[model samples]
Target: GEELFTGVVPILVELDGDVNGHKFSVRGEGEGDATNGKLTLKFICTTGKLPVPWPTLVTTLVQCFSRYPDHMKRHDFFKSAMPEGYVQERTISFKDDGTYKTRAEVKFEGDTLVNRIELKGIDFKEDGNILGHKLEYNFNSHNVXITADKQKNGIKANFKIRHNVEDGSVQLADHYQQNTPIGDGPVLLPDNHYLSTQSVLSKDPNEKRDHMVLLEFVTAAGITH
Candidate 1:
């Protein structure tokens, strides 16, 4: 994993941190009926198109980390091969056959967020065929400045995923009108821009499967300072 990696490290994986938001609440294996403070969860990513089963792979990582958390420090895996603004693309022809085909490109940088596809979009293809769409959802802390565009029939609409996340609600585009039926209420999961985007990416694929995981770390090192 390290040798194929040039400027990038591409060898290690780890978790980020607890989620905080008025409406965003993600409890862990340890929780109750209601939480007093912010919700917390040490979850692993699951349900993706990885070479192997995502849950099996992630749960295994969690198990390894629980026993050897210290060794799971920040690695330089995404150092060079994927710097800021780096874009990854995917395509499927017959996308316009109107039978639910899809193509995508994501601008994910800062850290080498490896495959298994858990992220959002940046740009969109226009001149290809019928029914075009473009979306940009940066799940940063504030949730401001997010934008989106889509075309159906002969009408093209544009707007933002605009929101003051600090207020506990995300302001969406025109699609979320009164006609929109809110289901099972809202998700108290992590709402940060990046995390929200990751969740959305995972969700649009498998609507019934769970996105979080159960962890069980099991390892240790030899040197003690």
Candidate 2:
């Protein structure tokens, strides 16, 4: 027998762009995704200096995710203070880069930042979908730097939710990773570090249900802190 499941998974989306005079803005969205969910993100430059390399702008946005988990947990206390679909969508316009505009609209239930759209000289979109008997996702964050050797200062986290097409049920998975640099002087660190988790839920009618992977991170230190 097939079962219909509807649950929630949190998503994170990041954005970066030049305004006019050396000023750049970074933002993130936390939300949940329903059936056929989507996120649209836009950034507009209104008044700051522009970065010479486009990759630099992208990298800055990727680095913004460092504090994503911190922000979500900090805002958790105010859960009751938000609206029914309290998810947030942010837009920044820079004065430079031709006053470039970018917008991100994410579809999520609670504390998940799903899909996103970036409008600069061109338009870019990121989406999550289910394929085969399993789910597959392609997510990319630019300008995010990490280290495998030395301690760094910053945090990063990601989450995903997959719905079974045959049964219509959902499974949730989440992970968090970070580093704190200790020594100064050029701040030499290791290489980029990454951590992730994958989960599958059973739809059997006679079986008891429970979360398989509670949570996973880069290291035990990341879990404790």
Candidate 3:
């Protein structure tokens, strides 16, 4: 049997973003790792506040997968932390009026809300690369790596977190008014960027950009007290 790991200090998470002028942050407790396996954690929405109405379907759902991916996973910022994993639990519960809802263990049957995802991330990058990221954030402390979904774990989660621990912070890319012309020989809207609908048909104005996102997580202090 695995000895239940224990530590003194609690875990914390802080985050940011700029999509449709929206962003969020969580200064509460968290657990698990997505690096090696299933990483599950939760936090009260401190900023960009909302008691966001979430589907109750996940309540009775045991295991599900949601591919709400962004630029960071695409860029391999999380490295091994972003793996082919299933979202085993849904803890970020919410009601209409903005109250934090509690969650529990459930069965894996009727009405399980799930999303189809292809689990794959880019390659590993050297520490020196993040020198630019560190310089970009001017972080007081950083370079902590993590993976939350490490398998059948509970609320009792801590990293044994020292430095070099990794976590992820997702930020979406901005949209553009016009899709740049693709190809040199013959100018045409890229098949990937745009598709004409039956009712509407146009090339240049029809480009739809998939959400490109970034993930950055640096716990200035997780060495609990």
Candidate 4:
């Protein structure tokens, strides 16, 4: 003989973007499983930062993300949400002349909130050729927010590169910009149900030139199933 029980599963999805190339989509589900005496959690996270052209800068950010002693201080809530073995795989690449291509991934397991991350890949060089190769990146959401840390040296180099391009100091072969909300209307989220929040940027314009970083997140309908 067998018996069946019924309950509801709570599903909550939250999204946020960080200045240091961290964008997250969190999905959580919860239901009581009395038999195991433990709550089972599952999360799928996709995270990555824009690629900085300098090798030293890439290396520094990687270290900041991975081995920084005060990890909790750096990421705050994220440090508490992730599992103990939270930090996962990271890969960095560079051309012969010190240019860079980088990628990183992290996973979080929690009783209430669960997620897995696929740090989006960046292909700056192809076939180990630097000069003619294209720099490309694919992100998860359309309505993205960008933030850069002016104090960080690597971030500074990134700032210079972007500022030059934005002000026409450097020229990109193909350039375009558009602004749209995520769910509906220009409100930053779909269905007018979610509200977009604001973030802080470096106060000093000169320091801003140093951070020189750009981060973007885009949401698409068919990408996740």
Candidate 5:
């Protein structure tokens, strides 16, 4: 038997768009066991301020793969941390109120490159189109990227997120109107990373740029701390 490795940290996934002027953030806590190969993550809308309710729809995607993907089985960390690999995705829709009535949770004990997805508040059509992703792999990390562009009755809602398992960073690119592109970096545990990039979709009819995002590392708490 091996020693048990446990980690708990907070994760915040936020989005900004000009489809009808909206900004949303999803906050949750993730608990993982490196020794037993398990991850439990839960996200809700009540943790922070809600976005403008127009557009009335939003979706989020999350993933966790090996830092060393090409030889995932060979990586010392992942070989013991998650032998079968890990990945997750979900969609959210707003209720009569601005916030979503339902929540999203992922409980994984172990991936065919296995993925656990939740469809509680998902629109099959909207969630169907986000699967076209490209892979960027390096010694530092393995990134899985996905982009979704959909326009419904003149309401254009697009979302994108790129997850890197090594550094535990996520790159978010979104905006149904003028673009607001941002990249990724690691963040200290317990604290949140609030980022902004350049965008033409600022608050004014005539304005400037937009923002960036951050990630919470579960295992790197010691080194990156």
Candidate 6:
């Protein structure tokens, strides 16, 4: 019998733009395909300043992942205690279909110092769609600061999420990719970079700023094992 084409794809998720005129860029890269994959999504805030607190940026990132079931709950449930500048850690394991586990934690130093959070071993699945059968993700948000000078408040946070696709689960037809310059356009490559831009209201409530999300990936076919 003929088997489906088996291979792997490299994935990249980039969040870049300016908040209150401060430029910043964050990237998440890993590999996955039809044969079970894993990704390491690190929230690395490279170059530029943020107008708000570090936690605000972290929460914003969390909101971006709200599309996933319970993915936003961690931020929601923990929001209250995060502002208290406390340190916490937690671990969980699941065995519904197979063995799975996660290691998560939080840290707070001072009102104007770098804080951190780590979310590891995250399972991936679309709410209503399916691409790769099996996916796993891990995240690390670090070097965040909330200072008096918005212009001086830089960041060093890295968010990592890796993916693993189960063998013989998804075919080439199951995945498609494309990208647009501004906000709307055709996703040309099944393995390429995509962007989404928006005007979000600022703290002043009188001005809207640039907010963009860039998702990039590379899907390739290879030997079936």
TM-score of each: 0.17, 0.22, 0.19, 0.21, 0.24, 0.22
Backbone clashes in each candidate structure, one number apiece?
12, 59, 27, 22, 8, 32
Scored by Cα lDDT, where does model 1 land? Answer: 0.21
Angstrom error at residue 201, model 4 = 12
Residue-wise lDDT of candidate 5 within 1-225, one digit each (tens)? 012233432233332222123234444344434332333443344423333221122223222221212222221222232223222222333221121222222223331122222223222222222221121221122122222222211111223333222335432323222111111221111111111111111122331221112232222111121
C-alpha lDDT of all candidate models, in order: 0.21, 0.27, 0.21, 0.23, 0.25, 0.25
Judged by whole-model lDDT over C-alpha atoms, candidate 5 comes out at 0.25
Q: Is candidate 3 or candidate 4 better by lDDT?
A: 4
Q: Write the per-residue lDDT of candidate 2 for residues 1-225, one digit (tens) a residue.
A: 000102334444444543333344333333222221212232233233223222223212211112223212331111211222112222322212122344433233344434343534322111221112222221222122223323232223232322232344332322123322222223222223332222222223442321011111111112222
Kindly report which residue pairs in candidate 5 clash with one another: 111-114, 196-211, 196-212, 197-210, 197-211, 198-210, 199-209, 199-210
Q: Which ten residues in a row have the lowest lDDT in candidate 2?
A: 211-220
RMSD of 1: 21.2
Which should have the higher lDDT, number 1 or number 2? 2
- Which portions of model 3 miss their true places by more than 4 Å? 1-11, 33-38, 51-225
- Which ten-residue region of model 1 has the weakest summed lDDT? 190-199
- The lDDT of model 6 is 0.25
The segments of candidate 6 whose C-alpha lies over 4 angstroms from its true place after superposition are 1-6, 48-225
Count of clashing pairs, candidate 6: 32
Question: Which model scores highest in TM-score?
Answer: 5
Residue-level lDDT tens digits of model 4 in 55-124: 1221112111111122222321112222321232223233232222322222223332222223332444
